Every structure is written in C-alpha cells, then in structure tokens.
C-alpha cells in the first residue's frame, strides 16, 4: 500500500515553484483539493522526492519524539496559512517561505505524514 505516500506527495510536495507568495498558496491549495473545508495550515516541501524519502533511512533522518523522524538536511518549504474568519471557501492563504529540516512519520520507508507543529 502506497495510498498514504501518494497522499503525502499530493498534500506536501511541490517540486518546482517559482514565486512562493500568497497567490501560490491560494492556487496550489485548490489544485490539491485542500479547500473544502479550508485546511488551516499546510506546508509544501520543494526539491527532489528522493531527499524526502531518505528521511526514513538513517541516510537523512534521526528518530524523533514518538515514532516520527526528523531530517538531517534542510528543505526549502512554503507554509500556507488560512486567514479570514471562515473554514469554507474561497480559501485565502498567507505564505511563508522557509528553509529548515522537516519532521515526518514513515511507514515502509516512505513518508506518510508531515508534522505541522514545527511550522505554526
């Protein structure tokens, strides 16, 4: 089963972004189906897939808290953060580009969850 890894890539991987602004967040949150209801906070990781996969191996991760993993290398990221009063669309987002290691959960050497706590 890979359904949760492919879901992870849909929710948290964008390979080649140029501008990582408010409008990027608004756009990509819709492309990936995170707008009914408006998801409160969501972070996309950039670069290649293989660096992210490698977080599950010792090659690029240490264990972390309860059964999570934290990357050794830093990733370019963009956190899209819902604003306005409503959980229902139109969903508008404030973007925060960052550069940092990431925390994921792994299952079968594949990341299936991003811990969003580190990006609040």
Numbering used by the authors: 2 to 121
The authors write:
K54 does not participate or belong to any of the known catalytic sub-sites of ANG6. The variant K54R retains ~49% of enzyme activity. In this PD variant structure this residue is exposed on the surface of the molecule. Also, in the variant structure the Arg side chain makes a water mediated interaction with R51.
Angiogenin (ANG), a 14-kDa basic protein is an angiogenic ribonuclease and member of the bovine pancreatic ribonuclease (RNase A) family (also known as RNase 5). Like RNase A, ANG cleaves preferentially on the 3′ side of pyrimidines and follows a transphosphorylation/hydrolysis mechanism. In addition, the crystal structure of human ANG has revealed that it has an RNase A fold and the catalytic triad (residues H13, K40 and H114) is conserved. The enzymatic activity of ANG is several orders of magnitude lower than that of RNase A towards conventional RNase substrates, but essential for its angiogenic effect.
